[PDB]
Design a protein around this ligand. Structure first.
Ligand SMILES: COC(=O)N[C@H](C(=O)N[C@@H](Cc1ccccc1)[C@@H](O)CN(Cc1ccc(-c2ccccn2)cc1)NC(=O)[C@@H](NC(=O)OC)C(C)(C)C)C(C)(C)C
Lengths: 99, 99
């Protein structure tokens, strides 16, 4: 859909049959989700915004469902205040910014 | 434009004769610029990124130009790595997320 920015662009995502609320974020290189167990090998990583960096676990080739759109790619898991769909996944659903 | 997210959505902003590079950021409630002097009164705010909070100075009714779109609103100044155009000014240019 075409979506407004008068409110935060929160959408429902599906991961491992977990239902979660996540932010569509054009200012995020990566996708970062709050703490959750995902199966498989992961590598340690740090990511940062304002305020400093956080340590996360990097899971590759994770399926996610974003508003009826089934993508698979890299998911970071760690102490993020909120679930964040960054450009790696936004790209996979043909999401653009428009004005 | 219809901006793909295959790269970071970096654009030119003009603020008081200063040209700057800034990131179109749907994950940001607020617009946050790196350290600069701005005219007028200001209030301290605290804003929260991924790593925690920073203190900024809030300037109200600051004219800003985004891709030659003339906009006026709240601009926060402080220790950000990158000039961030948040939703307060993205809504002013009629910006939507499309997928
Ligand atoms: C290359 O680095 C990045 O891309 N960093 C990303 C990042 O932090 N992006 C920032 C912008 C940014 C880019 C590059 C360097 C530094 C910062 C934002 O897109 C997402 N970010 C991360 C973030 C987003 C939301 C929230 C949040 C908190 C409480 C409730 C809802 N959301 C917290 C952190 N948002 C905020 O930090 C904003 N915060 C905000 O809008 O808070 C209400 C600010 C900006 C206004 C402070 C991620 C770690 C998410 C991948």
């Amino acid at each position: 859909p075409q979506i407004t920015l008068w409110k935060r662009p929160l959408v429902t995502i599906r991961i491992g049959g977990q239902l979660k609320e996540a932010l569509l974020d054009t200012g995020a290189d990566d996708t970062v989700l709050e703490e959750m167990n995902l199966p498989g090998k992961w590598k340690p990583k740090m990511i940062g915004g304002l305020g400093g960096f956080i340590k996360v676990r990097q899971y590759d080739q994770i399926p996610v469902e974003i508003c009826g759109h089934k993508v698979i790619g890299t998911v970071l898991v760690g102490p993020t205040p909120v679930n964040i769909i960054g450009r790696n996944l936004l790209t996979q659903i043909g999401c653009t910014l428009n004005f």
